[PDB]
Design a protein around this nucleic acid. Structure first.
Length: 49
RNA sequence: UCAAACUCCGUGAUAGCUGGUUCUCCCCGAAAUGCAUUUAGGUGCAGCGUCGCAUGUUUCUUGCCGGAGGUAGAGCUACUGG
């Protein structure tokens, strides 16, 4: 019989959150931003070239 | 404390700048170029990476073939000049 502990999300339904800045074995020490620039502390507008 | 005091608030001011950004392993893996920029230590796009999808050897290497060049070299009584 189907109880609450039998319920599971479907495969691929749930992907783990990527946690940046949590070590160099992951997206660590820059969070995929690279080193410097405007793009290292802010985001650049799309309306700007 | 003074080329405009101090305090609170606006306010977590803004900083193309500096610094920092914390556990793991597996696979792949750059760039530091071009163009433009009140631009030149920034940024957009392209190039280069990855992932996915589609296509599938088209890529690449070698041989052969067809081709255009004007460098090296050479030449100048073949031009311009010396």
């Amino acid at each position: 019989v189907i109880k609450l502990h039998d319920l599971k999300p479907a495969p691929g339904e749930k992907k783990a959150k990527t946690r940046v800045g949590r070590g160099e074995g992951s997206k660590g020490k820059t969070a995929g931003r690279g080193t410097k620039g405007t793009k290292a502390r802010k985001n650049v507008p799309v309306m700007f070239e």
